Design a protein around this ligand. Sequence first.
Ligand SMILES: Nc1ncnc2c1ncn2[C@@H]1O[C@H](COP(=O)(O)O)[C@@H](O)[C@H]1O
Ligand SMILES: *Cc1c(COP(=O)(O)O)cnc(C)c1O
Lengths: 70, 823
Amino acid sequence: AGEENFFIFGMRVEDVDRLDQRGYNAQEYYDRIPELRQIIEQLSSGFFSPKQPDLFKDIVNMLMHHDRFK
Amino acid sequence: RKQISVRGLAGVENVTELKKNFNRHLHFTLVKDRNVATPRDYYFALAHTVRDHLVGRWIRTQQHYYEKDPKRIYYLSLEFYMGRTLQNTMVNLALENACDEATYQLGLDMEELEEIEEDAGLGNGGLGRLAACFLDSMATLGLAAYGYGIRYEFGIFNQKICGGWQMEEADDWLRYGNPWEKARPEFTLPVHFYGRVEHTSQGAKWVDTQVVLAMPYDTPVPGYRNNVVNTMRLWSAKAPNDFNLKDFNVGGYIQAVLDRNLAENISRVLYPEGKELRLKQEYFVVAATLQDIIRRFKSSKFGCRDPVRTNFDAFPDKVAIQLNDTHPSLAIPELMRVLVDLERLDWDKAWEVTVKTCAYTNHTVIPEALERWPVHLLETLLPRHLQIIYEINQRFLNRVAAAFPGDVDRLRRMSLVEEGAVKRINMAHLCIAGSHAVNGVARIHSEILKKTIFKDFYELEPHKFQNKTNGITPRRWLVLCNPGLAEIIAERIGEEYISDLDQLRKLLSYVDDEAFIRDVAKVKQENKLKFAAYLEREYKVHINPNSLFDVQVKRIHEYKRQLLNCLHVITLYNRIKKEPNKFVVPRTVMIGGKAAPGYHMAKMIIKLITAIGDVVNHDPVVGDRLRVIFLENYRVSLAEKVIPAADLSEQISTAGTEASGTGNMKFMLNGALTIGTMDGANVEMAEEAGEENFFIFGMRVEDVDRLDQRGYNAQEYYDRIPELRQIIEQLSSGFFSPKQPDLFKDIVNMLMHHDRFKVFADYEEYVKCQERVSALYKNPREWTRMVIRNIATSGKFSSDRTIAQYAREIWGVEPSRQRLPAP
Ligand SMILES: Nc1ncnc2c1ncn2[C@@H]1O[C@H](COP(=O)(O)O)[C@@H](O)[C@H]1O
Ligand SMILES: *Cc1c(COP(=O)(O)O)cnc(C)c1O
């Protein structure tokens, strides 16, 4: 198709291998990236869940603290 | 009739009498003979000779509570880790010397026979050890208490270590009788299941329910020389046996041979998810129990003291119940069903009584571990019950609303009905609302309840949330298990300590008396001495008596961290090998404890410990400077051999996790220095003994939240600490596992990339605090004066203190070490 003709992005295999080697910490991205910080805090307040705000709690921790898939 | 008395049948501290009794029971109770008796047999001759006395005073005490009619207390716990009765009974009734002599004059040795008893397998860990202590303290305080649980027939598993892997065999401790128990077929009760609630005219009726029988078994519990003897009453489930033709359900189909075995295995085993049997086991223990509880309120004289309704108004004056952990919560709506539906009160006169009866001990901190049953699951087998929980719920949320008006979100958090995919009933929140007292079991713990877990229950009900720090009996865990240290502490200050433990501060005088200090150190030389030997006799190893007996006995679970301890032992191993001729204090590291089946991490840590064992214990360069031993089938009678022998108690969990920890304590009283993190019951020990008599280390709860805050990243500790990096690469290459290199792949990876508990983080600090430990062991007079200071301070940890605090601030009765009359 041609590389231009394709929206191919993000990490390739090397960088994940290299981030597994240098330890991946999810907090560090959260503290820089500003709309991210914002939407995680939205998920915890229970923006997207008023009746059980608490409900998405495990998606947060999964990400925040223990995500294999980056 | 008056002619039929307890009276003529004894001689008590009398050799010749007990030798006469022993010969009857061997030949008339046992219908055995000297020409035929086993060791197993001479302990049922002896245990029966020691039981006569144990029951004559039970006869007397129970009559004594009917006549005195004291408010009664009932500890509802699904696990009583009793474990070995001959000696606690011999020493709580003071017949040990007289017996030792009788059996001795007969020509058997009493110690032989003592070891044939298999531990009374009705328990599992913390929760259930505790309950067992509280019975010896509650009898001793002359309180009219009771212990009610299930009699498990197969306990929980016995641990076998085969191929350095854990094999779970079955505990049929019930194999040749348990002489300490009495079967009462005649008080069998219906426990009801499934069914439907037919609401008729004046209420609702719970119709069409399967019935299971609850048979009781009575085990007398002797207080310490105060002549009381209470009861632990456990229930054995049993099938109805109409199953053949009587009912016209069978004949044509006995596929309900099933009903029969699903019923018997409520009493078959301990547990060990939302399982229909766990709830069956919970309801079962409660219900047959609440009919004995209400029965005695009617029959124990109070049938002639009715005044009005044989009133259940006089019920919280004269009965008291304890929910020891959410495993009896159904006692609360089981009681509201008995009062409203079966008796006939209105729902407030029924609730007043229930909330004025139930007090519930807590022992959990993490949300994730509070009890929560699915409501459909309560619909099918307990339909009336989940109707009564919903009543409770409506009203409790209307109270809450009277109080925090406008807040809906609090209402939707405090309710007993949790919502998600699969709605559940917060058995935690049931317990709190149906109670006049909630209490953690250690100060840091009770406060985190009020602060973070149970908080909206404390703004609403502040007064309710107390605490009553855990404690241990001194009789099992110092006299019985340590006659030697029992002996020299008697020399310098006499008995009242055994019956009054903060009286051990008197020992702070002797801190520098060279007699004392040779004698505390000598008693320990000899406790280690015999344990080196069973570690040869009953299992195998070459122990060096003269080493730092480093022990760690915990639930083999990730957060308890025997992988922090595995890393320090690989680090001594490496050290002693890079430099074979440096003086490093010789150690015997010993770890023991059960996995609990199917937990794969745990089962791999038990193998890790034995892999390391095999390597260091066969490395010739090492000699006896280092040995790693896995103790197998840790249970109450090992705990009583290993604890006298320990010099270092390793109480190392992640800062913030242990809620308290009953064994923390067992060690202190037995003179062993504690290495451990600032959490649980370390917190009030490092306060009682003064911090510098303690080896407190690591991260504090403070800096664990902090670590989570900037995100713990294991690899950075990996990249600075050079001995760590070394052990990780040893684990992976299969230095410890040569035939399968890749065998510890999971543990490694765990540590390195997803350890919820921050083992690496406490690795520099822990190796250095141990360096300071071997340093102080290298100087016998100061390590012994630390020890004297930790023993002198044990008092804040008697179960006699804890039980007192129960009797006075929750159950409302008064302790008494006064002797009851009897025989
Ligand atoms: N009405 C009573 N009068 C005197 N002693 C009693 C009475 N009821 C029970 N006991 C004693 O208490 C023991 C336990 O009673 P129960 O609660 O029926 O298991 C009995 O074995 C007797 O020793
Ligand atoms: C006291 C005791 C326990 C308690 O475990 P902790 O780690 O101390 O809470 C466990 N097992 C036995 C045999 C005990 O006596």
